[PDB]
Design a protein around this ligand. Structure first.
Ligand SMILES: NC(=O)C1=CN([C@@H]2O[C@H](COP(=O)(O)OP(=O)(O)OC[C@H]3O[C@@H](n4cnc5c(N)ncnc54)[C@H](OP(=O)(O)O)[C@@H]3O)[C@@H](O)[C@H]2O)C=CC1
Ligand SMILES: NC(=O)C1=CN([C@@H]2O[C@H](COP(=O)(O)OP(=O)(O)OC[C@H]3O[C@@H](n4cnc5c(N)ncnc54)[C@H](OP(=O)(O)O)[C@@H]3O)[C@@H](O)[C@H]2O)C=CC1
Lengths: 398, 397
């Protein structure tokens, strides 16, 4: 019988990814895994009908059950408001979910030996996480119409003396100026998420800053990461033969173009079908996995007109496998953990054996010289994955 | 020989120092006589002169309008030890760009037999960002606890002050900063860009994120257009080239979908193929160099008597970009022809299958290159020298 998988929050989406999402469940997940599935429909029509309440409920569910897997969704704009006759221009579901969960987003390209890469030496991927700039963040920028002083001041709540910094004296002409800020707590959450990410994947962790220029702003990221590491993670890192190190952003871009890959890169600041995303909350317990791409509207329109499509499902499949692998980790569920690994290997192996969608065939041959016999359409490719998955799991039972 | 005029030359360090002398000996000096202002920016000489030679080199470029620079060591702690330096001298490139100002444009040289990132790129993409000197700093500080951070603009006459709340720290501290740009720096950026797209005959695109920074980036967009509509749109349409603003997201898109051939002004294969040019606001002064370092790892092999294969292309194009600009300022037609002929010979040689190991590895993959697929540093220079002799001979008859 099937693997007992536990509690998973699933979020259905829109357009081409909604189609692929249901194929993934039907052909690759549901035949092998039984889940206590908390399923929320974030399709644009349901978000409109529920006044976006379904989106906030999904976020709350992810908070409670720790594991979310999300399908790409339409973020409305004025054209979408017309297309769907929306009540309002609903905010992005990803923005709403992130604001409720906090955490840092890590992006990871899936590597196939036969698919050309930027750096030829990159055997293992680089997992990049950017300091979340949030949706309630806002820099304060304005036009400087003419000569005068721009100053930035800090007034302590504790009543001690106010501090004034000259930003620039405009002696002739005008220009622009702005102020930015970050709270210690965001930086701490960023450090924790990054340390947990590195511990989970078993790779070393690099933070890059410009603390040679922004000695105080970037110095704070550097210091807070270092303090949290030494005090809470160093021994854990050593236990797994990994490390954490700060790097100047220049030394980083070098170190990486010459490296083999296989590390986590946090910074402050290739086919989209192979890019995964995961929201890692600072608690180390809660994650939300998704494809890094959108709903592939262009393909969806072809699908509506009954034309043949070739949409890459890999990023969407890995959203499931990262979600299930984290669930297996929380529950100490060995069988689910093997399943999630096996499905990742089947996906990669299928491409590496020469069965792939048109985006990948074009990477290999060049778009001008791709032929229909070089690639599989969306449904043929899912069918091939499904057959290779069955073979892989029968081999595992020997 | 061609009478070439005044060129400021800066000698450098390690592997690039050796290639640089080979370029002069085999490719330049046999055909061009220069009133040569040479500054030795080798690390030993900068240490001995207390970095004065670097400041004199910058002044010479300011005076003579054309500089060509070999790559130089930027000291770190290990270099201090290696050379017993008196100080951690600052980067010579920083010092020079601080004195000269201007915009840095980077450009990969394209050889049709060398794989590129986007296989569709057949014409050059030239990326410019503005060099804001050391006086262009942000003002950043630690916020030690709860309190209010405000940014205020006070006009010179005292009226029409505005105070903007940046953030109310309610539960702890953090960091904050202010930054600025003067209209003059943006106008300089815009002029360098418009005049690069003209000097080269390609369309110019500016990209911003003015959807977020509505005011800050709006100012770059508005000033670029203003300077265009009023000072360049005529000469632009005369060369069937255009200017256009685009959001970064869009730009990145259309860029891969295109075959290249544009100047990309940005509001923020092989290194041996990447060129750099600092273009000063004055439209007159230019500093050209390779967009790579001194190639230390190759120099260590050379020091042990081991064969090397170091690509000279970027260093050669520092010379041809410099000499082409010198030719433009002096209306020197023989010089202009020479500089272009050297670029053609360089590209032609590689496209004929004669290349250094880095390019051979791009084609074959590093585990697959065999010795017969490439030439070492000295063989490649000789091949170029021979093809240059032929190219210039045939142009006479
Ligand atoms: N997390 C989310 O929920 C996301 C939401 N979106 C939503 O997605 C919708 C469309 O956004 P769009 O701008 O089209 O960006 P998409 O990423 O959805 O698609 C962009 C293009 O990238 C290529 N591409 C992306 N994913 C794949 C894939 N899996 N297989 C093959 N090719 C792929 C296609 O290029 P080609 O055209 O060359 O085939 C596709 O047209 C919008 O409504 C947007 O709001 C977008 C961002 C993220
Ligand atoms: N403008 C300047 O003066 C510059 C100064 N530097 C200085 O250069 C020194 C070394 O810098 P480094 O970090 O080694 O970076 P480099 O750019 O000097 O060399 C880095 C690597 O890139 C490849 N490479 C670079 N140029 C060539 C070339 N012309 N032909 C073939 N391969 C090339 C080699 O890779 P492989 O090892 O794979 O063969 C080389 O080891 C430092 O002292 C630094 O300060 C660095 C940048 C700019």
């Amino acid at each position: 019988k099937k693997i007992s998988g536990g509690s998973v929050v699933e979020m259905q989406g829109d357009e081409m990814t909604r189609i692929i999402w249901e194929l993934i469940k039907e052909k690759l997940i549901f035949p092998y895994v039984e889940l206590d599935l908390h399923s929320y429909d974030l399709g644009i029509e349901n978000r409109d009908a529920t006044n976006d309440q379904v989106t906030k409920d999904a976020a709350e569910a992810i908070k409670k059950h720790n594991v979310g897997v999300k399908c790409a969704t339409i973020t409305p704009d004025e054209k979408r408001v017309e297309e769907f006759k929306l009540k309002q221009m609903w905010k992005s579901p990803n923005g709403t979910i992130r604001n409720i969960l906090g955490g840092t987003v890590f992006r990871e390209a899936i590597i196939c030996k036969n698919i050309p890469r930027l750096v030829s030496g990159w055997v293992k991927p680089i997992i990049i996480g950017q300091h979340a700039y949030g949706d309630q963040y806002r820099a304060t920028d304005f036009v400087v119409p003419g000569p005068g002083k721009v100053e930035i001041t800090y007034t302590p709540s504790d009543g001690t003396q106010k501090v004034t910094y000259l930003v620039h004296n405009f002696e002739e002409g005008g220009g622009v100026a702005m102020g930015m800020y970050n709270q210690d707590k965001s930086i701490e959450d960023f450090a924790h998420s990054s340390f947990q990410m590195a511990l989970s994947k078993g790779w070393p962790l690099y933070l890059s800053t410009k603390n040679t220029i922004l000695k105080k702003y970037d110095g704070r990221f550097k210091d807070i990461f270092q303090e949290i590491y030494d005090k809470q993670y160093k021994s854990q890192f050593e236990a797994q033969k990994i490390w954490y190190e700060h790097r100047l952003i220049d030394d980083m871009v070098a170190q990486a173009m010459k490296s083999e890959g296989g590390f986590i890169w946090a910074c402050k600041n290739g086919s989209l079908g192979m890019m995964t995303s995961v929201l890692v909350c600072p608690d180390g317990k809660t994650v939300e996995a998704e494809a890094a791409h959108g709903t592939v509207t262009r393909h969806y329109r072809m699908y509506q007109k009954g034309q043949e499509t070739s949409t890459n499902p890999i990023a969407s499949i890995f959203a499931w496998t990262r979600g299930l692998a984290h669930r297996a980790k929380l529950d100490n569920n060995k069988e689910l953990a093997f399943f999630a690994n096996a499905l990742e290997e089947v996906s990669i192996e299928t491409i590496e054996a020469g069965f792939m969608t048109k985006d990948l065939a074009a990477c290999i041959k060049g778009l001008p010289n791709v032929q229909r016999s070089d690639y599989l359409n969306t449904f043929e490719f899912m069918d091939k994955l499904g057959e290779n998955l069955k073979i892989k799991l029968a081999q595992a039972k020997l």
